[model samples]
Target: PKVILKGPLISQFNFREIYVNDRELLRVLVKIDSKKHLILNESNQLKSGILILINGKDWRLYRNQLLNDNDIIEIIPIN
Candidate 1:
């Protein structure tokens, strides 16, 4: 899944990619309340302190939210 965010300031933004050292494969995982909210988060959290989202939505929506192979994660306005 790919999301396009309308940003006024692009150059001043900061983004980071974590997990899955092998770029050939991509898996989406999320955590909250000190628990693995998604299946991918169960054993992937230790890999990095990163968060995954889909269309600006988190795993809280359900229990398991995994991203497809061609999903794109975009970090918006981070300090």
Candidate 2:
């Protein structure tokens, strides 16, 4: 199941879980979120205001974090 979200900015955003492909975090987000709700700026970093974590650890600690089956990802909105 997709992870549920909460926080002040959530209402203005949309989110989804990656179930099939194993790719970079930004790639998966950009591809799945066609509305362009998530984006990687010219610096190759994600736009600010979104919080991401995996298995309770900060997502930024990993590079191109490859998501495997049964992974638990959390996306929380923060203003």
Candidate 3:
């Protein structure tokens, strides 16, 4: 399935497609931003003061949820 990444989480590109399954949201994020390490910590978890949303819902609820095609992931920084 193809997933879309949006928002400030991504620094290089605004959007792109990638295959994913049996993967936690945080893990997927680590894979996506493997080079940047912008919002992820050494534990592969989101850093404090950061928030991720899937289809406009809190990502925590879908931490272990399977990702579907065309899922829009948005990352936001909290001030």
Candidate 4:
């Protein structure tokens, strides 16, 4: 399955199209933010205040869930 990841910090205007084949949500996030630009710590844990949404739902609830094709992942920073 493939997914679309987007955010102001990611690209501001365009979204990234990623192909996910048996990959976890966190793993995919780490790969996308390989440069560690997002609010991710050394342990790959999301820092507080940063909101990650998958299909309009909180990512924390689906961190371990496998993404579906065309799923939209949005990264929103809360201050």
Error of 1 at 39 (Å): 14
Provide the global lDDT of candidate 3 against the true structure: 0.66
Point to the candidate with the largest TM-score.
3
Candidate 3 segments exceeding 4 Å error: 1-23
- For 1-79, candidate 1 gives per-residue lDDT tens digits of 4433224222322213433322211332232112433223445442333333554565335344455555554433222
Instruction: Tell me how far the alpha carbon of residue 30 in candidate 3 is from the true structure, in angstroms, after superposition.
Output: 1.1
Candidate 4, residues 3-79, lDDT tens digits: the string is 55445554732456666553577776677667754657888888776787788888778647667756776767676
- List lDDT for all candidates, in order: 0.35, 0.57, 0.66, 0.66
lDDT-wise, the better of 2 and 4 is: 4
Query: Could you arrange the candidates by TM-score from highest to lowest?
Result: 3, 4, 2, 1
Q: Would you estimate the TM-scores of all the predictions?
A: 0.27, 0.60, 0.67, 0.66
Poorest stretch of ten by lDDT in candidate 3: 1-10
- Can you rank all candidates by lDDT, best first? 4, 3, 2, 1
- Residue 67 of candidate 2: its Cα lDDT? 71
